[PDB]
Design a protein around this ligand. Structure first.
Ligand SMILES: CCCCCCOc1ccc(C[C@H](CC)C(=O)O)cc1CNC(=O)c1ccc(C(F)(F)F)cc1
Ligand SMILES: CCCCCCOc1ccc(C[C@H](CC)C(=O)O)cc1CNC(=O)c1ccc(C(F)(F)F)cc1
Ligand SMILES: CCCCCCCO[C@@H]1O[C@H](CO)[C@@H](O)[C@H](O)[C@H]1O
Ligand SMILES: CCCCCCCO[C@@H]1O[C@H](CO)[C@@H](O)[C@H](O)[C@H]1O
Lengths: 258, 258
């Protein structure tokens, strides 16, 4: 058990290093010293005009909302490849894999957004841009509702000071979740998750030897993320109800379908 | 390119399907399987001569063995599909949608390879269960059997070989009008490529065949009707035979078929 955990953790980290475009290590070097700062309409237009970088244009709040969907779609592709590299995730039947991804990606996305964020804003477009928290909060309701809860979570999450190797096991535990609706092989997914959680506590003891209560704090963060996604899906429902001209990407339609 | 397309599909077929039609026709012709034709021969077959939920009765036992072969063939069809150009490029939920509505059409076409008018090869060709015995099972279980033999005899009269079947099965899976497909234009495009490859392949492989390609297009329509009728019998069995188990994968496949 103790010898198999270190190899397991290393395999998952490699799956992480191989599949995600931005690491917290890379992100943290960009945010400590250059990204083009986007803080109003004019700089946002600048960024789109090649300094940094879709359905037909409409308005600024809707354009940003569309760029949020695009990052989700791309992060889902990365999370799908990550999960496939996970031990025995690929042994599940394909429909169980889709179930885990469907109900797990947004929990993992919000955890991973914390890596590319500080209290003042968000790295965008491979870290070549930085969009400020203040500009994001200046958008129109209902679109601005979805913004600040994610910053409030990320600031508290970044306080735990996790690194990419911790995060790789954290995300894997989010995905391999046994109580997802419609899951076929519940005992098999619970088994995989228990191994990942075991590997995670072992990894934390070695990587953060002085850290107080870090494993149960992380388990609590997993419950916070489910609550965060719950509130986020509620706000997406309001956007769908009250902003009928605004489009939702087909993949997000499938994720949010009941 | 188009020959290369067919050769790639053919190799993914030989790589992923343990029993080929060539092999099956060698066994069934005589280049010798234990014949299962009644209760006693079936018992001998289970007692190591040839080879699950707890036993209930004979007709349910065979019904369970039918489910086991579907589960195993879905696994092979999943890997065959994942080896097809641009099937893997679809999103995973679209891949599952195609398999969900495609596997039984492919399964019934592929079962024709291991069948003659008298019965069916079982357990890697080591057994042969007679159409006679299968028809003699209790209703409602026996109802699922004879429409399949009817289809297969006529299907075998076209005298396809494994090279033809590989493209036929690929065309069945990559099917653009499956319910709930996300990227219909991309699936329709892949299907059109397979079908053009098949037309081209049948020209070379069956030069003297008359109307073979449109006959095969008609067999694909016949397969879809055979599966609709089969799905209705399966739902009636779940209604009237509450003690009989249905494998979870089959529960998920038949959940929304009418
Ligand atoms: C740590 C918290 C950061 C909070 C910021 C809000 O970020 C988000 C909130 C919610 C979602 C979930 C989506 C909603 C459609 C889903 O439902 O899938 C995604 C993002 C990700 N946003 C971006 O990456 C982003 C934002 C702006 C721009 C730009 F440059 F245009 F301004 C470019 C990219
Ligand atoms: C012309 C083609 C063949 C026709 C014969 C009927 O065969 C079938 C009909 C319907 C299905 C679809 C399933 C049903 C649950 C689904 O709904 O998925 C599968 C089979 C495949 N049967 C077997 O392989 C089989 C049968 C008997 C035994 C044995 F030895 F125990 F008696 C062992 C294996
Ligand atoms: C192994 C490939 C064949 C799998 C076929 C079974 C697919 O079932 C479907 O899986 C989906 C989750 O992914 C659910 O949303 C659907 O409710 C369910 O019907
Ligand atoms: C790309 C991996 C992430 C996919 C997440 C979205 C999955 O959507 C679900 O796909 C299933 C078909 O497979 C359908 O049965 C469900 O109705 C649908 O909600």
């Amino acid at each position: 058990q103790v010898a198999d955990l270190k190899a397991f953790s290393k395999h998952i980290y490699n799956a992480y290093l191989k599949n995600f475009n931005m690491t917290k290590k890379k992100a943290r070097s960009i945010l400590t010293g250059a990204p083009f700062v986007i803080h109003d309409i004019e700089t946002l237009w600048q960024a789109e005009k090649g300094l940094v970088w879709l359905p037909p244009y409409k308005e600024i709040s809707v354009h940003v909302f569309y760029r949020c969907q695009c990052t989700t779609v791309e992060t889902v592709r990365e999370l799908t490849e990550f999960a496939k590299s996970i031990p025995s995730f690929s042994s599940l039947f394909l429909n169980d894999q889709v179930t885990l991804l469907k109900y797990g990606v947004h929990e993992a996305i919000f955890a991973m957004l914390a890596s590319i964020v500080n209290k003042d804003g968000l790295l965008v477009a491979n870290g070549s841009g930085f969009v400020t928290r203040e500009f994001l909060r200046s958008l129109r309701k209902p679109f601005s509702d979805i913004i600040e809860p994610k910053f409030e979570f990320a600031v508290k999450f970044n306080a735990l000071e996790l690194d990419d190797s911790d995060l790789a096991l954290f995300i894997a535990a989010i995905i391999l979740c046994g109580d997802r609706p419609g899951l076929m092989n519940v005992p098999r997914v619970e088994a995989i998750q228990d191994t990942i959680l075991r590997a995670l506590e072992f990894h934390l003891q070695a990587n953060h030897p002085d850290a107080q209560y870090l494993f149960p704090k992380l388990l609590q963060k997993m419950a916070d993320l489910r609550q965060l996604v719950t509130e986020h899906a509620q706000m997406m429902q309001r956007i769908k109800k009250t902003e009928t001209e605004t489009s939702l990407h087909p993949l997000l339609q499938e994720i949010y379908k009941d």
